Enzyme design. Structure first.
Site, PDB file in Angstrom:
ATOM      1  N   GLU A   1      45.080   3.184 -19.593  1.00 51.49           N
ATOM      2  CA  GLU A   1      45.025   1.721 -19.621  1.00 51.49           C
ATOM      3  C   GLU A   1      46.190   1.115 -18.882  1.00 51.49           C
ATOM      4  O   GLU A   1      47.353   1.448 -19.123  1.00 51.49           O
ATOM      5  CB  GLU A   1      45.103   1.218 -21.061  1.00 51.49           C
ATOM      6  CG  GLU A   1      43.937   1.765 -21.887  1.00 51.49           C
ATOM      7  CD  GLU A   1      43.663   0.995 -23.147  1.00 51.49           C
ATOM      8  OE1 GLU A   1      43.514  -0.242 -23.066  1.00 51.49           O
ATOM      9  OE2 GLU A   1      43.665   1.621 -24.227  1.00 51.49           O
TER      10      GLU A   1
HETATM   11  C1  LIG Z   1      41.672  -5.873 -20.734  1.00 46.85           C
HETATM   12  N1  LIG Z   1      40.326  -5.489 -21.205  1.00 46.85           N
HETATM   13  C2  LIG Z   1      40.477  -4.073 -21.543  1.00 46.85           C
HETATM   14  C3  LIG Z   1      39.341  -3.679 -22.512  1.00 46.85           C
HETATM   15  C4  LIG Z   1      39.735  -2.269 -22.986  1.00 46.85           C
HETATM   16  N2  LIG Z   1      39.253  -1.913 -24.335  1.00 46.85           N
HETATM   17  C5  LIG Z   1      39.377  -0.451 -24.271  1.00 46.85           C
HETATM   18  C6  LIG Z   1      39.343   0.197 -25.650  1.00 46.85           C
HETATM   19  C7  LIG Z   1      40.723   0.884 -25.803  1.00 46.85           C
HETATM   20  N3  LIG Z   1      40.841   1.148 -27.253  1.00 46.85           N
HETATM   21  C8  LIG Z   1      42.234   1.323 -27.688  1.00 46.85           C
HETATM   22  C9  LIG Z   1      42.939   2.641 -27.292  1.00 46.85           C
HETATM   23  C10 LIG Z   1      42.168   3.928 -27.666  1.00 46.85           C
HETATM   24  O1  LIG Z   1      41.023   3.945 -26.847  1.00 46.85           O
HETATM   25  N4  LIG Z   1      42.912   5.217 -27.497  1.00 46.85           N
HETATM   26  C11 LIG Z   1      43.824   5.352 -26.492  1.00 46.85           C
HETATM   27  C12 LIG Z   1      43.430   5.176 -25.130  1.00 46.85           C
HETATM   28  O2  LIG Z   1      42.238   5.188 -24.805  1.00 46.85           O
HETATM   29  N5  LIG Z   1      44.474   5.063 -24.210  1.00 46.85           N
HETATM   30  C13 LIG Z   1      45.816   5.191 -24.573  1.00 46.85           C
HETATM   31  O3  LIG Z   1      46.744   5.054 -23.760  1.00 46.85           O
HETATM   32  N6  LIG Z   1      46.145   5.438 -25.832  1.00 46.85           N
HETATM   33  C14 LIG Z   1      45.201   5.492 -26.792  1.00 46.85           C
HETATM   34  N7  LIG Z   1      45.508   6.085 -27.997  1.00 46.85           N
HETATM   35  C15 LIG Z   1      46.889   6.274 -28.487  1.00 46.85           C
HETATM   36  C16 LIG Z   1      47.533   7.523 -27.896  1.00 46.85           C
HETATM   37  O4  LIG Z   1      46.661   8.654 -28.026  1.00 46.85           O
HETATM   38  C17 LIG Z   1      48.832   7.806 -28.659  1.00 46.85           C
HETATM   39  O5  LIG Z   1      49.671   6.675 -28.448  1.00 46.85           O
HETATM   40  C18 LIG Z   1      49.674   8.986 -28.137  1.00 46.85           C
HETATM   41  O6  LIG Z   1      48.884  10.125 -27.759  1.00 46.85           O
HETATM   42  C19 LIG Z   1      50.685   9.387 -29.212  1.00 46.85           C
HETATM   43  O7  LIG Z   1      51.456  10.512 -28.825  1.00 46.85           O
HETATM   44  P1  LIG Z   1      52.783  10.791 -29.701  1.00 46.85           P
HETATM   45  O8  LIG Z   1      53.453   9.507 -30.040  1.00 46.85           O
HETATM   46  O9  LIG Z   1      53.522  11.953 -29.117  1.00 46.85           O
HETATM   47  O10 LIG Z   1      52.076  11.199 -31.104  1.00 46.85           O
HETATM   48  P2  LIG Z   1      51.083  12.438 -31.438  1.00 46.85           P
HETATM   49  O11 LIG Z   1      50.093  12.717 -30.356  1.00 46.85           O
HETATM   50  O12 LIG Z   1      50.643  12.163 -32.843  1.00 46.85           O
HETATM   51  O13 LIG Z   1      52.079  13.704 -31.445  1.00 46.85           O
HETATM   52  C20 LIG Z   1      52.783  14.063 -32.653  1.00 46.85           C
HETATM   53  C21 LIG Z   1      52.603  15.559 -32.841  1.00 46.85           C
HETATM   54  O14 LIG Z   1      53.317  15.998 -34.022  1.00 46.85           O
HETATM   55  C22 LIG Z   1      52.478  16.891 -34.731  1.00 46.85           C
HETATM   56  N8  LIG Z   1      52.990  16.881 -36.085  1.00 46.85           N
HETATM   57  C23 LIG Z   1      52.761  15.927 -37.044  1.00 46.85           C
HETATM   58  N9  LIG Z   1      53.434  16.143 -38.164  1.00 46.85           N
HETATM   59  C24 LIG Z   1      54.181  17.291 -37.917  1.00 46.85           C
HETATM   60  C25 LIG Z   1      53.911  17.750 -36.625  1.00 46.85           C
HETATM   61  N10 LIG Z   1      54.420  18.859 -36.057  1.00 46.85           N
HETATM   62  C26 LIG Z   1      55.269  19.458 -36.908  1.00 46.85           C
HETATM   63  N11 LIG Z   1      55.636  19.149 -38.170  1.00 46.85           N
HETATM   64  C27 LIG Z   1      55.079  18.036 -38.723  1.00 46.85           C
HETATM   65  N12 LIG Z   1      55.429  17.703 -39.983  1.00 46.85           N
HETATM   66  C28 LIG Z   1      51.091  16.321 -34.513  1.00 46.85           C
HETATM   67  O15 LIG Z   1      50.275  17.460 -34.680  1.00 46.85           O
HETATM   68  C29 LIG Z   1      51.149  15.972 -33.029  1.00 46.85           C
HETATM   69  O16 LIG Z   1      50.859  17.129 -32.202  1.00 46.85           O
HETATM   70  C30 LIG Z   1      44.505   6.466 -28.852  1.00 46.85           C
HETATM   71  C31 LIG Z   1      44.777   7.397 -29.870  1.00 46.85           C
HETATM   72  C32 LIG Z   1      43.724   7.763 -30.723  1.00 46.85           C
HETATM   73  C33 LIG Z   1      43.957   8.786 -31.820  1.00 46.85           C
HETATM   74  C34 LIG Z   1      42.405   7.243 -30.537  1.00 46.85           C
HETATM   75  C35 LIG Z   1      41.271   7.658 -31.475  1.00 46.85           C
HETATM   76  C36 LIG Z   1      42.162   6.363 -29.472  1.00 46.85           C
HETATM   77  C37 LIG Z   1      43.190   5.961 -28.607  1.00 46.85           C
END
Ligand SMILES: [C][N][C][C][C][N][C][C][C][N][C][C][C]([O])N1=C2C(=O)[N]C(=O)N=C2N([C][C]([O])[C]([O])[C]([O])[C]OP([O])(=O)OP([O])(=O)O[C][C]2O[C](N3[C]=NC4=C3N=[C]N=C4[N])[C]([O])[C]2[O])C2=[C]C([C])=C([C])[C]=C21
Ligand SMILES: [C][N][C][C][C][N][C][C][C][N][C][C][C]([O])N1=C2C(=O)[N]C(=O)N=C2N([C][C]([O])[C]([O])[C]([O])[C]OP([O])(=O)OP([O])(=O)O[C][C]2O[C](N3[C]=NC4=C3N=[C]N=C4[N])[C]([O])[C]2[O])C2=[C]C([C])=C([C])[C]=C21
Ligand SMILES: *[C@@H]1O[C@H](CO)[C@@H](O[C@@H]2O[C@H](CO)[C@@H](O)[C@H](O)[C@H]2NC(C)=O)[C@H](O)[C@H]1NC(C)=O
Ligand SMILES: *[C@@H]1O[C@H](CO)[C@@H](O[C@@H]2O[C@H](CO)[C@@H](O)[C@H](O)[C@H]2NC(C)=O)[C@H](O)[C@H]1NC(C)=O
EC number: 1.5.3.14
Lengths: 462, 459
Positions: free
Chosen positions: A58
């Protein structure tokens, strides 16, 4: 200096990597499960590997490069596809069959987006301490001038799609100031790319790990004795002179420092005992932040009965019950001809659903589907997968969400080290909590703080 | 000075009364509905009058006297009964048939109570600024050491009965600092008394109004031209010199000040236009506070099929869907022989239900009752009454609730006048927001503030 890193998810492997880079190679990475990658982890469903956890990179195509992108899209070449949400208005189903008129829906979406933009302007002006923060919902009421936020079936699923599907808890619980706008998007770009590769998104972690841990020449399996899997840390004792770490199988290790990478939910569950107990300010900081849950329910059918084609990947169910099996995705590109569907739920529904049988959940979903495609002969799913992250003790949820109520200073207390005990993980990401890139970056950041103390004798935190 | 009071609910009547007592009698009370009393209001259901709005005098038998009590219990002698919640453990129904083991439930209740108690200790230590406040849920997580608050059906319904049934929104949205402990109980006592008198709980308001408004010697009806019903205010213009108030029927009135008593929900809705627009600080405080909704769904049956007897008054349905038709009450004492049951819902369920037909709601409820009393032949309810407060433009909800995020200073901004525009009502009560006694005291306080400014020039 010897350092023990608890957990081999993205942040732990990332932190150990950075430490290795600064020359701190006397490392011991203790991973609870039998594998690395943590919340990035795939599984076989009906013959295909699907992601139980993170699925998208993302924040792409923006002013700065999300560090996860190149590894995914170039170094490893993981198969992936840009998600396109531009056609949602043509895909919102009525509680009682068929979709709503597109123009009607596009208007509701446009209005929701305008309120949110007004919200980003307000957010920029709020006092940096977080003391004037308010929930996203309060901002909605303010801009819509209503004593409630979205409340009709269509506006509510549009809201859920806009917010809950990203943050995993409702606007009313979520911090405006810390999520609108969201840095991940502001800094890295508005796009998102869904990884659909047999090797799994987790390959990114194995890649990084391989940059400094020894691997088998024929299998390429990591064989470095510095990585120890199936080692569940149950107690961390720390003093002015060092730290001692005990696992469930009774192993005991010593180091100069320990780096804790376990999720916020783990920390909130007391799986690991700290001795001495963490200070109250730390404890409160831990409990005040939220560990959300996002359940990806996969279903497999004997035949296809939903639309495929331009703009069909994502579709919504306008239930009169907010968040009820609302956000659907079909895989014509990712798993062609597999006949799989993925419905996403979070929060309250996630907790309800994790607590009942998959068979019961499947039956609930079948009534929804038959109501959505009344003219089709909708066959019962022959297979279903309900990920249970909240019930899994090594995770206790899927990712953190910044709630109204936690201020800037309280979030810093959540990240702050305690003696020789350091913290890392997505929940410690300054601006990207909740994401893979946030985990990755938090690993480097926490390691550097440790490097300063250890190598430059700079041990004071803030 | 001439003063217009918007709304004839408890705080409006209370404020006008206080003004009159200061000798400010050139008053004009403009009420939207055809009657006074607002959120205290009865209706006939099944040949009997039940309360659509407030039903209890809450906070009784403590260190201070709740001002409403003597009026209800002594002056008017409205018929009433102390609610006893001591037997809930024997009355929690499983989603699919019969009650849970009483000892198991009593212990769950105890844990819940104990956690709240610790929350009370914690709350005492937070700072006045509100900088360290948190939602009640965050406190439950902290006190129980879990990443979640109550989450099994039984724990959830216990949680819902302890918080949502009081505040009408979930603990996770609720300010701990400002609700736990709650002044109403801390000051006035822990008991609550359920009013079940055909004259209605609203009689309290009528009595107060009759202390200064004129009433017909035969009928006893108010006939003072200073009270005008069916007057929906839609616009309030103000200047440093005075105000003008316009009603939906096109009437226009002038005065030196205006005292607005409409609910916070009405104020969040834009039904009333201010000109000029209220300032940003006012607007933000208005929208940041919560106007909750609590729906009392009454049902009448051809015959009883639920238990009656000691500890039977209140019972819970532990659905796996939080807050689904969860809190029940039977009226063996209140309306003996009536065959009426009351199920209460709030918030999300209230908005969904108000939006569907009564028949649809009845059918949903029949499915739950049948699941609850599998051993009986449960007759379909003969009648149902679903109050629609959130949908009613003159209320837009049932009572405020204090959300995490708003501190005392911002809450007080709600009470703050704007020039000559004064505010009153339960959402302006310094320590009793959400109650009949808070609306009452709020009218007196707001009036006093206007009196000192207007009469002594001390604003
Ligand atoms: C502007 N317009 C636009 C529209 C758009 N809408 C789309 C829907 C989106 N939804 C929200 C978000 C969700 O899908 N997912 C994801 C994605 O796809 N991408 C990204 O970037 N992210 C996300 N996520 C959250 C992630 O996977 C997280 O932040 C990371 O991988 C965390 O890493 P770190 O801080 O290094 O932690 P971890 O893996 O948990 O590692 C730790 C380790 O340690 C171990 N242990 C525990 N306890 C203990 C240990 N060793 C020793 N000793 C003790 N006591 C464990 O086993 C591990 O290996 C996400 C997530 C999730 C689950 C889902 C279902 C989804 C998502
Ligand atoms: C320790 N232990 C504890 C246990 C206990 N539990 C039980 C349960 C409780 N629940 C909660 C509560 C309820 O129930 N409710 C009630 C009761 O019961 N009590 C009390 O105290 N309270 C209550 N609520 C509340 C009340 O009611 C209120 O607050 C009052 O009343 C208010 O008053 P104010 O502020 O004055 O207001 P209103 O009434 O609204 O008035 C106003 C007026 O104005 C008018 N308007 C509007 N708009 C306009 C006008 N005019 C002219 N123009 C314009 N534009 C209106 O019409 C009125 O009249 C309650 C409530 C409710 C609703 C319910 C349902 C319930 C309750
Ligand atoms: C993701 O990776 C692919 C792999 O290269 C990128 O596509 C290449 O881009 C260069 C830039 O002009 C071209 O010369 C290649 O022909 C492209 N390859 C293919 C197969 O078309 C692609 O642009 C990357 N996507 C993002 C968003 O970075
Ligand atoms: C509410 O009012 C009733 C009405 O009196 C109270 O009951 C009386 O209390 C006096 C005080 O000594 C007795 O002498 C009477 O015999 C009592 N009357 C009855 C009918 O028992 C009652 O105690 C009041 N409750 C509260 C909580 O104030």
């Amino acid at each position: 200096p010897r350092v023990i890193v608890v957990g081999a998810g993205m942040s732990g492997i990332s932190a150990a990597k950075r430490l290795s880079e600064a020359g701190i190679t006397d490392l011991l990475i203790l991973e609870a499960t039998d594998h690395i990658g943590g919340r990035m982890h795939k599984t076989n469903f009906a013959g295909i590997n699907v992601e139980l956890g993170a699925n998208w990179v993302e924040g792409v195509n923006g002013g700065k490069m999300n560090p996860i992108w190149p590894i995914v899209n170039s170094t490893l070449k993981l198969r992936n596809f840009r998600s396109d949400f531009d056609y949602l208005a043509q895909n919102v189903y009525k509680e009682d069959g068929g979709v709503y008129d597109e123009d009607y829906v596009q208007k509701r979406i446009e209005l929701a987006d305008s309120v949110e933009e007004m919200g980003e302007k307000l957010s920029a002006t709020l006092h940096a301490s977080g003391r004037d923060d308010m929930s996203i919902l309060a901002m909605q009421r303010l801009n819509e001038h209503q004593p409630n936020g979205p409340a009709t079936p269509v506006d509510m699923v549009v809201d859920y799609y806009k917010f809950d599907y990203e943050f995993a808890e409702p606007p009313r619980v979520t911090s405006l100031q810390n999520t609108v706008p969201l840095a991940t998007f502001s800094d890295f770009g508005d796009d998102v790319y869904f990884v659909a590769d047999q090797r799994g998104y987790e390959a990114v972690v194995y890649y990084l790990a391989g940059q400094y841990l020894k691997t088998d020449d024929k299998s390429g399996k990591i064989v470095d004795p510095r990585l120890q899997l199936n080692k569940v840390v149950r107690e961390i004792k720390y003093s002015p002179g060092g730290v001692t770490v005990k696992t469930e199988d009774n192993s005991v290790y010593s180091a100069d420092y320990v780096m804790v990478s376990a999720s916020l939910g783990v920390l909130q569950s007391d799986l690991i005992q700290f001795k001495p107990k963490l200070p109250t300010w730390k404890v409160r900081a831990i409990y005040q932040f939220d560990m959300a849950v996002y359940t990806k329910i996969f279903l497999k059918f004997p035949r296809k009965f939903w639309p495929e084609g331009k703009g069909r990947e994502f579709f919504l169910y306008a239930s009169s019950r907010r968040g009820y099996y609302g956000v659907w995705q079909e895989f014509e590109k990712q798993y062609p001809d597999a006949n799989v569907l993925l419905v996403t739920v979070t929060d309250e529904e996630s907790r309800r659903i994790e607590q009942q049988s998959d068979e019961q959940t499947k039956a609930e979903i079948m009534q929804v589907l038959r109501k959505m495609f009344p003219g089709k002969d909708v066959p019962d799913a022959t297979d279903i997968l309900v990920p249970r992250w909240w019930s899994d003790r090594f995770y206790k949820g899927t990712f953190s969400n910044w709630p109204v109520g936690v201020n800037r200073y309280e979030y810093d207390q959540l990240r702050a080290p305690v003696g020789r005990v350091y913290f890392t993980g997505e929940h410690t990401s300054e601006h990207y909590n909740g994401y893979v890139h946030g985990a990755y970056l938090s690993g480097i950041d926490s390691a550097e703080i440790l490097i300063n103390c250890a190598q430059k004798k700079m041990c004071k935190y803030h």
